[PDB]
Design a binder for these strands. Structure first.
Ligand SMILES: [Zn+2]
Ligand SMILES: [Zn+2]
Length: 75
DNA sequence: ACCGAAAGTTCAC
DNA sequence: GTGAACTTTCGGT
């Protein structure tokens, strides 16, 4: 939806469940094949590339979604 | 060879 | 100025 163009999907999770970041032809967990639980060791960046930033909150604080040149309220 | 995930980037409000 | 959204490339299976 906000992340990927898929209305049913929300952008969180993945087809394989080995990640979280997805907004294109990556892995929309619609049907899936059942794989989540506690499956650790998954390299995904859900948030912005900024190490100091965590992705929460914006520079103006009027929004929350930021993962590029939008609004990191920190380093 | 095919499928999935991620980077960097770009358009609209 | 800020937020929000797309295409393409690389890596893994
Ligand atoms: Zn999706
Ligand atoms: Zn950040």
């Amino acid at each position: 939806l906000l992340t990927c163009p898929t209305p049913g999907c929300d952008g969180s999770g993945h087809i394989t469940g080995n990640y979280a970041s997805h907004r294109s032809l990556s892995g929309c967990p619609l049907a899936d094949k059942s794989l989540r639980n506690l499956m650790a060791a998954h390299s995904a960046d859900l948030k912005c590339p900024t190490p100091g930033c965590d992705g929460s909150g914006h520079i103006t604080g009027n929004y929350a979604s930021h993962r590029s040149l939008s609004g990191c309220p920190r380093a």
